[PDB]
RNA sequence: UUUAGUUGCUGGGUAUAGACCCGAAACCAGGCGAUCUAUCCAUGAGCAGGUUGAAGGUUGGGUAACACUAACUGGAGGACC
């Protein structure tokens, strides 16, 4: 799992302003870090469906935020997906 | 109570022997054969030419990851002509 320091580094890197924790960039980066972290758990616990539901919820939330950001500003969307490595 | 036998030689018959001659399928004992053939052991040799295209591998697409998937390779088989 990730710690407060790890989350703070991501927030500081992707923040668009001072004390900015609500921007789509920050939210999507946090969700991406959490999703990449959980892949290790689901490798050793393949039959844990109850947690996989929460993982799917994280994926859906990331998709919705990405679509909203693409609608608001295309340049920011491309920059964020490039910085995070997401294919879409 | 019956009062001529016996020993030779020749001949007829019988018995024991192959016993008038020829003829089995068999049974038993001791030896000879695996240069043919059956199986096995050791050491060598042989199988023109042409098809089909298993496993495996690489790359790409796809997925939140897995799945799934296309092409290229690869050369299996009591496989095919």
Swiss-Prot record:
Family per similarity comment: Belongs to the universal ribosomal protein uS15 family.
Gene3D superfamilies (alphabetical): 6.10.250.3130, S15/NS1, RNA-binding
Name this polypeptide is given: Small ribosomal subunit protein uS15
The protein's assembly and partners: Part of the 30S ribosomal subunit. Forms a bridge to the 50S subunit in the 70S ribosome, contacting the 23S rRNA.
Function comment: One of the primary rRNA binding proteins, it binds directly to 16S rRNA where it helps nucleate assembly of the platform of the 30S subunit by binding and bridging several RNA helices of the 16S rRNA. Forms an intersubunit bridge (bridge B4) with the 23S rRNA of the 50S subunit in the ribosome.
Organism whose genome encodes this protein: Acinetobacter baumannii (strain AB0057)
Cross-referenced CDD domains: Ribosomal_S15p_S13e
Listed InterPro entries: Ribosomal_uS15 (IPR000589), Ribosomal_uS15_bac-type (IPR005290), uS15_NS1_RNA-bd_sf (IPR009068)
MF annotations from Gene Ontology: rRNA binding; structural constituent of ribosome
Keywords of the record: Ribonucleoprotein, Ribosomal protein, RNA-binding, rRNA-binding
Pfam families tied to this protein: Ribosomal_S15
GO terms for biological process, alphabetical: translation
GO cellular component: cytosolic small ribosomal subunit
């Amino acid at each position: 799992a990730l710690t407060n320091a790890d989350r703070a580094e991501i927030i500081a890197k992707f923040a668009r302003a001072e004390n900015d924790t609500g921007s789509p960039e920050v939210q999507v980066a946090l969700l991406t870090a959490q999703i990449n972290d959980l892949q290790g758990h689901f490798k050793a616990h393949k039959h844990d469906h109850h947690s996989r539901r929460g993982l799917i919820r994280m994926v859906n939330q990331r998709r919705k935020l990405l679509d909203y950001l693409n609608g608001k500003d295309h340049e920011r969307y491309t920059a964020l997906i490039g910085a995070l490595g997401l294919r879409r």
